[PDB]
Amino acid sequence: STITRPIIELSNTFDKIAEGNLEAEVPHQNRADEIGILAKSIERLRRSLKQLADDRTLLMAGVSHDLRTPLTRIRLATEMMSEQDGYLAESINKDIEECNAIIEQFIDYLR
């Protein structure tokens, strides 16, 4: 059974990696023979995946902030327009709301 044990365990580890589960642990990590080296390789790949996820999250936050600036600018500007063009200012306000919804939808999809 010891011959079949490590292969079965490695299969389970691959499944966890495929499902984006970076919380699962790798078995036989402390082995010294070729099996131990192979397990270490899997652990390295898993770590790289987790790092990539963190980097992606940081990039998303940066983009959301940068786009917050132009939206705020258009809002403050429109508020000062005369009454004669009130319909124009209202249309621009609606457009900004749609823009914000698109950005929020993106974070929702990834989140």
Added chain:
Amino acid sequence: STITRPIIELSNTFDKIAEGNLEAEVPHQNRADEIGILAKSIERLRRSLKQLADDRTLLMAGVSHDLRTPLTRIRLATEMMSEQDGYLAESINKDIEECNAIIEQFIDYLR
């Protein structure tokens, strides 16, 4: 040695996967014994990564399109404002240009 060959090859495959290289091929894919099964597991994980990349690209295009709509709307509206408020319309136009630059910067980073 024949026993050392497959382990060395598997190690090289793990390195390619870790470096985000989904063009590299997996060895021993056609094997029938436990080694062949393990190799198939690696190929499955690699395939999943490639699929995620393609999906991310499609998602980016969808998001860029949706945001194109609000930007176009604000431009056409502002162009019709009276001369007395020309400075306000100009400021809003500048804001839209900044917004477009932010979205373009994101695509540039990924691409």
